[PDB]
């Protein structure tokens, strides 16, 4: 039987695909992540800060 790739197939989303967490995903640190300043961060007073000298 034709063992080739069957170029005419269904190129779509396959909606009934496993919609779960993929336990084997890369558990590492992702070095290529946004190293910037996070301009939208908590600008408040941080009440739990060092209350000593």
């Amino acid at each position: 039987a034709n063992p080739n790739a069957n170029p005419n197939a269904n190129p779509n989303a396959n909606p009934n695909a496993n919609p779960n967490a993929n336990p084997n995903a890369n558990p590492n640190a992702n070095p290529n992540a946004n190293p910037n300043a996070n301009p939208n961060a908590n600008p408040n007073a941080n009440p739990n800060a060092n209350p000593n000298a």
Epitope: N40, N42, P43, A45, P47
Partner: antibody, heavy 122, light 107 residues
Framework: VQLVESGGGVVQPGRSLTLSCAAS????????MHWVRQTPGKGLAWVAI????????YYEDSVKGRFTISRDNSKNTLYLQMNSLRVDDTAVYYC????????????????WGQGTLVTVSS | IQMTQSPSTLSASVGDRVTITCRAS??????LAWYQQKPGQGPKLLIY???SLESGVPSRFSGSGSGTEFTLTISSLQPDDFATYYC??????????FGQGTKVEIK
């Protein structure tokens, strides 16, 4: 808990104007505040943020280098020194206090001032 | 992050049910807020983090959503609830932006 501003008025383009924002009823030194514009015919637009001590500030891309936000924790007062005003810059300016959040991602603007009028024309 | 609110004007009567829809051009997670500005005053917070209620707000106001579709639901419109409502987003690395604002008028 009250937030009252002043220092508005009408000036010609190219001049400098200084707004103020006096806070009362709460520890003003604990809060990073914002300035927010309201131009009629358009929704609110963010202007500047001050990071509770003066370490960090961030401005809207259209006011970078012309608006200088600053604060004075000893008098409970903000300062937005405006330089080189254009006819675009006419709107109502509001102070905004960032709500206390139990995280690191900030929160919405809970306390707002009554707004002041800054009009520019020839 | 362009924020759009629809419908721009929503006529309703006292005791009706009003839903205002806020759509974000990009995913803003659950960081979103709703305001209410009566004419001549300063806006006051109603909902923060897109679900929680600000202290002292009536229990009528409620909101839900995450990602790009956010709605605000008023169970029973009141005669002091006729004001302009604004949608704000503060994503992680995005700055604060506001929607155009819908005005709820008396039918």
């Amino acid at each position: 808990v009250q937030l009252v501003e002043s220092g508005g008025g009408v000036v010609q383009p190219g001049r400098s104007l200084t707004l103020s924002c006096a806070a009362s009823g709460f520890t003003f030194s604990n809060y990073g505040m914002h300035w927010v514009r309201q131009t009629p015919g358009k929704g609110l637009a963010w202007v500047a943020i001050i990071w509770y001590d003066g370490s960090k500030t961030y401005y809207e891309d259209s006011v970078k280098g012309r608006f200088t936000i600053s604060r004075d924790n000893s008098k409970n007062t903000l300062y937005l020194q405006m330089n080189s005003l254009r006819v675009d810059d006419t709107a109502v300016y509001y102070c905004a206090r960032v709500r206390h959040s139990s995280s690191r991602h900030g929160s919405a603007f809970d306390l707002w001032g009554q707004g002041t009028l800054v009009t520019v024309s020839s | 992050i362009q924020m759009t609110q629809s419908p721009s004007t929503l006529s309703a009567s006292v005791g009706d049910r009003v839903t205002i829809t806020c759509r974000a051009s990009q995913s803003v997670s659950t960081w979103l807020a709703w305001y209410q500005q009566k004419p001549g005053q300063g806006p006051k917070l109603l909902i923060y983090e897109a679900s929680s209620l600000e202290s002292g707000v009536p229990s009528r106001f409620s909101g839900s959503g995450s990602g790009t579709e956010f709605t605000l639901t008023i169970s029973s419109l009141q005669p002091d609830d006729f004001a302009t409502y604004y949608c704000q987003q503060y994503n992680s690395y995005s700055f604060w932006t506001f929607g155009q604002g819908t005005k709820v008028e008396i039918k």
